[PDB]
């Protein structure tokens, strides 16, 4: 079918520690809203964690995109992995978010990736956060629930989110999900668990503002994934950052390659629905003519031809995490070669310290030069994260492009 715009569109998603309930909540959101809006397509647990490797490991590995809507807005929701081995996919998912739903297990409280996800969500531009305290069906001590809530707000404050003001809904994604299976038509007010899901939706509706979109700037879309649609071609997916794109437009594939590739857009879809035009904010699949899935990849960006120039060298202001925040135990030197994350791009870079600065310690606030091993679309003021050896080691901002 063709996508019909009738209400504002917002991109949300789920982040949080492994096993805290992100995928269960995601499925519940689709079932709950579907009872009220026939246009919503239901997605059960196994329809989201559907890949063979996910069934093999028993965890989410790939980001999943599901759609649902309330009376007020239309939502694209990205469900991310909580396992530490897949932090890379979580970052790519967060880069598509206008707001995030932080899931925390009431039974376990804040764990290492609860903190790491909050820190990373910020560095990729997530402005707002709503908390769903999950698994309360397992905690009878009210004091504990109040304690976890306090801990979570404290954590958010540590990373510059308004911890004291964020809505914190307490519920059970699983019990809400079970109820909807028993009665798919369950409406608001009928069941306790389902009502808590409605509470979350109301908070999303009202707390996360609809972003100001720039549909008049040159088209720019960070690529999050790429695949082949047999008999149709190569599709690049991602959230349009600014501008618009129409079937027939020419776009440039920028970054990660020595040279830039140009091709024509032959299709645009949002959630398998046809669009004549994709605009800033939409989460879409863009069909590209004449390129194979080995010619486009995650981390590159599609852009209006000639509007972007990929760079490799820049100066940056950086905060280096302390051991206590999951950071490094020891300092590093000039020549350190960690991974840098900008939006959906992940690239190796070489740290070059200025003379007189020969070492950087955890907890330090420094400025230094970074030289990337591959060209990528960059801009001054662009935030980024630094990871190395399975941990996030720093967060920074690009202050000046050098080349
Ligand atoms: N008791 C209880 N268990 C729950 C609840 N929500 C989820 N679970 C369970 O806890 C486990 C993890 O749930 P899941 O949704 O896959 O977690 P996730 O946060 O998406 N994990 P990952 O980080 O791999 O993506 C499952 O066994 C699931 O049934 C809940 O409200 N109550
Ligand atoms: Mg999951």
Experimental method: X-ray
CATH code of the domain in which 109 resides: 3.40.50.300
d(CA 206, CA 223): 29
300 lies in the same domain as 317: no
d(CA 200, CA 198): 5
- Ligand 1: distance of its center to the CA of 264 in Å? 42
Residues marked as binding for Mg(2+)? 23
- The reply to whether 22 belongs to the active site is yes
Return the residue whose CA atom lies nearest to atom 27 of ligand 1: 19
Q: Which of 44, 72, 83, 369 is catalytic?
A: 83
Q: Which of 6, 7, 9, 23 is catalytic?
A: 23
Total domains in the fold of the chain? 3
At what resolution in Å was this solved? 1.7
Q: Which of 389, 390, 400, 330 is nearest to 362 (CA)?
A: 330
CB 123 within 8 Å of CB 341: yes
The secondary structure element, H or E, covering residue 171 is: none
- Ligand 1: distance of its center to the CA of 91 in Å? 20
Radius of gyration of the chain (CA): 21
Query: At a CB cut-off of 8 Å and minimum separation 6, what does 12 contact?
Result: 75, 76, 77, 78, 97, 98, 99, 100, 101, 204, 208
CATH code of the domain in which 249 resides: 2.40.30.10
192 lies in the same domain as 246: no
Tell me which residues have their CB closer than 6 angstroms to ligand 1: 16, 18-24, 59-60, 81-83, 134-135, 137-138, 172-174
d(CA 381, CA 396): 9
Domain that holds residue 81: 1-211
β-bridge mates for residue 74, sequence order: 9, 69
Q: Last residue of some domain: 305, 331, 349?
A: 305
d(CA 386, CA 369): 13
Q: Which of 6, 7, 9, 22 is catalytic?
A: 22
CB atoms within 10 A of CB 204: 24
d(CA 154, CA 383): 23
d(CA 337, CA 373): 10
20 lies in the same domain as 167: yes
- The reply to whether 309 belongs to the active site is no
d(CA 314, CA 120): 21
d(CA 386, CA 395): 6
Residues marked as binding for GTP? 16-23, 79-83, 134-137
Three-state SS for 332?
Answer: strand
């Amino acid at each position: 079918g063709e996508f019909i715009r009738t209400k504002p569109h917002v991109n949300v998603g789920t982040i949080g520690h492994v096993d805290h309930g992100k995928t269960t909540l995601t499925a519940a959101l689709t079932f709950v809203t579907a009872a009220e809006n026939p246009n919503v397509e239901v997605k059960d647990y196994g329809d989201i964690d559907k890949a063979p490797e996910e069934r093999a490991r028993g965890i989410t590995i790939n980001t999943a995109h599901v759609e649902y809507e309330t009376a007020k807005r239309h939502y694209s929701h990205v469900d991310c992995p909580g396992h530490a081995d897949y932090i890379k996919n979580m970052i790519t998912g967060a880069a598509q978010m206008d707001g995030a739903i932080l899931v925390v297990s009431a039974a376990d409280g804040p764990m290492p990736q609860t903190r790491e996800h909050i820190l990373l969500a910020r560095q990729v531009g997530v402005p707002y956060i709503v908390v769903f305290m999950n698994k309360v069906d397992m905690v009878d001590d009210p004091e504990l629930l109040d304690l976890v809530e306090m801990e979570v707000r404290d954590l958010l404050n540590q990373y510059e989110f308004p911890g004291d003001e964020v809505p914190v809904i307490r519920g059970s994604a699983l019990l809400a999900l079970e109820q909807m299976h028993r009665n798919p038509k369950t409406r608001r007010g009928e069941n306790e668990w389902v009502d808590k899901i409605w509470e979350l939706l109301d908070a999303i509706d009202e707390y996360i503002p609809t972003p100001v979109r720039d549909v008049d700037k040159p088209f720019l879309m960070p690529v999050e994934d790429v695949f082949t649609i047999t008999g149709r071609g190569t599709v690049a997916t991602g959230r349009i950052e600014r501008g618009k794109v129409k079937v027939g437009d020419e776009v440039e594939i920028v970054g990660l390659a020595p040279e830039t590739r140009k091709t024509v857009v032959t299709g645009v879809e949002m959630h398998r629905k046809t669009l004549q035009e994709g605009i800033a904010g939409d989460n879409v699949g863009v069909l590209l003519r004449g390129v194979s899935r080995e010619e486009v990849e995650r981390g590159q960006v599609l852009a209006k031809p000639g509007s972007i120039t990929p760079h490799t060298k820049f100066e940056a202001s950086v905060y280096v995490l302390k051991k206590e925040e999951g950071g490094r135990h020891t300092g590093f030197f000039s020549g350190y070669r960690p991974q840098f994350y900008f939006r959906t791009t992940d690239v190796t870079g070489v740290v070059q310290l200025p003379p007189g600065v020969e070492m950087v310690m955890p907890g330090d606030n420094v400025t230094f030069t970074v030289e990337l091993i591959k060209p990528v679309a960059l801009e001054e003021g662009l935030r980024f994260a630094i990871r190395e050896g399975g941990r996030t080691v720093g967060a920074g901002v690009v202050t000046k492009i050098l080349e």
